[PDB]
Amino acid sequence: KPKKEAQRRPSRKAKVKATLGEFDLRDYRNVEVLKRFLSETGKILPRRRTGLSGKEQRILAKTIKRARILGLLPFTEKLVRK
Amino acid sequence: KKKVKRQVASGRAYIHASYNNTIVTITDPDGNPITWSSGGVIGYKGSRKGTPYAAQLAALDAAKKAMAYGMQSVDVIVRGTGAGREQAIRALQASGLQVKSIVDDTPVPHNGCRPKKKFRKAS
Amino acid sequence: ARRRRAEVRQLQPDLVYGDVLVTAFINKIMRDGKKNLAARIFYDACKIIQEKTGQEPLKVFKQAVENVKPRMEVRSRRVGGANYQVPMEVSPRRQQSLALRWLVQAANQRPERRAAVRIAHELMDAAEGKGGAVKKKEDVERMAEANRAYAHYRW
RNA sequence: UGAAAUGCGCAGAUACCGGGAGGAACGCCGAUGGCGAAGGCAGCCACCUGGUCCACCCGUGACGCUGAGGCGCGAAAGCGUGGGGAGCAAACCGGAUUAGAUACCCGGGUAGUCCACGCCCUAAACGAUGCGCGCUAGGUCUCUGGGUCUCCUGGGGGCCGAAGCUAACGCGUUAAGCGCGCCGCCUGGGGAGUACGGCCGCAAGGCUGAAACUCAAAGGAAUUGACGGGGGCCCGCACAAGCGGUGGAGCAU
Ligand SMILES: [Mg+2]
Ligand SMILES: [Mg+2]
Ligand SMILES: [Mg+2]
Ligand SMILES: [Mg+2]
Ligand SMILES: [Mg+2]
Ligand SMILES: [Mg+2]
Ligand SMILES: [Mg+2]
Ligand SMILES: [Mg+2]
Ligand SMILES: [Mg+2]
Ligand SMILES: [Mg+2]
Ligand SMILES: [Mg+2]
Ligand SMILES: [Mg+2]
Ligand SMILES: [Mg+2]
Ligand SMILES: [Mg+2]
Ligand SMILES: [Mg+2]
Ligand SMILES: [Mg+2]
Ligand SMILES: [Mg+2]
Ligand SMILES: [Mg+2]
Ligand SMILES: [Mg+2]
């Protein structure tokens, strides 16, 4: 946008590093890793970001939730600046 | 003591903005409040309380009256969705109050409580 | 004037001073298009200023205007709901406009029974931060040292 | 709030901090997605349970498709008994707008929305398109299993399109194409989904459902145009900026 549309995303391809490397998706403890799959707030990021497929996120999510109940990961965190 | 001129030097600056009025607040580093002003506190009675001035102006009185207890630097805390955001802030950034941090904490129900008819659609 | 933005016509410099603003002012005093009459009036009024004042006539004029020129206005708009004031900076093309216009008005507003007198003096009154002329620049730039609520425009 | 007012606040409200009770829904993921016969169904967890797709070709051996009547399921609302009742909100109470407002706006508020069992059964219950099966170009995106795996083969969801179809819009291997089986249903509008009879319901009502009479139409899609308190673009002293004037008086016409 404005004359950019800012929606030009050439199917990524070779996605940098695919966001990390080799980390389960049903780890109801492995925070260290999960902490990255969340916006400034415990707001699970969309597909647009991260770098996951169908069944995957269905899991990542199903997990992050299982994590919050363990008090490991956050539901909603405050915003700095702006 | 009498009315006691208490020194605080630092505290909070909660700001509530919405389609109706803008309430700024000053508090101690432990939540406890010191002094709050608003749009109402200064003339402005009707929709003039949601007037962006309702931000700064109040967000000056919060300051002035808040510098009287020392406070030189404050940690801002925005809330609500409407107008007056940042203004109340900038207002403090010229008020004489150094601004430590600016944070947002607007409370959005993870879907609970049926909103009033007045609220329902969006797109 | 939809597009093209009309182009500011430029007058011919003065004959006794050769400096735009002079004519421009001259012009504002004029009525029914009479130059000469209106001309004498300014030149007359320019004379009366070398006496009642030692300062050259031009400097009294030019320095009486800049004290008039407004630097802010209030172009109303419809933020919806009501008719807001909305104040803005004065394009330097306009300041002059109002400025001189103002003078000539306030002038005629005064008591004296003349043309020059009315003019010379209020000029002079203007070169000291005084006069019904300057009075208006004040009542103006005041309705604009604050504005009035455009928060829906967030930015 | 368009402005407001009712309303709540010095028995100190709002705004901020801490703690406690309660009900309801359940953010972001989440989608152009998924599953289900439909209604419908999303915090997480476990358990009990349905359906379904694929790979293997292993077992039965036509055992199949449809389905009048029957029976069961069936949003919301409503009904009965009992509980619960945070927010919301018919009726109703006030506030305001209006020429008048038993309305749009505003502040409260009961049934209700909630759960249990029982009842109701309707719906733009719509894909407005019965079920099953065989046949007829592709391309593109997407969910899910197999795969010698960014390519081919199966199931499901969208898009665009061959032939063909269609009154047109459109549909087009998720056919509204080509065919076969079976089932429901239509046979001009209004009167009527009304009247009567019957069945059903605690009731509200529901299903079945006419005619007299009356009108030459009711109607579907698309074309041109006009119109919109629809939209984008765009001109004209049309507005604005500005100068003079008219509306006042005497007179003239
Ligand atoms: Mg206060
Ligand atoms: Mg208005
Ligand atoms: Mg199972
Ligand atoms: Mg059957
Ligand atoms: Mg119900
Ligand atoms: Mg009940
Ligand atoms: Mg109550
Ligand atoms: Mg039909
Ligand atoms: Mg294989
Ligand atoms: Mg398919
Ligand atoms: Mg097509
Ligand atoms: Mg064709
Ligand atoms: Mg009926
Ligand atoms: Mg009967
Ligand atoms: Mg019809
Ligand atoms: Mg039609
Ligand atoms: Mg012209
Ligand atoms: Mg005009
Ligand atoms: Mg007249």
UniProtKB/Swiss-Prot annotation, chain C:
This is Small ribosomal subunit protein uS7. One of its GO terms (biological process) is translation. PROSITE patterns: RIBOSOMAL_S7. The gene is rpsG. CDD domains: uS7_Bacteria. The keyword Flavoprotein does not apply. Keywords: Ribonucleoprotein, Ribosomal protein, RNA-binding, rRNA-binding, tRNA-binding. It holds the Pfam family Ribosomal_S7. Belongs to the universal ribosomal protein uS7 family.
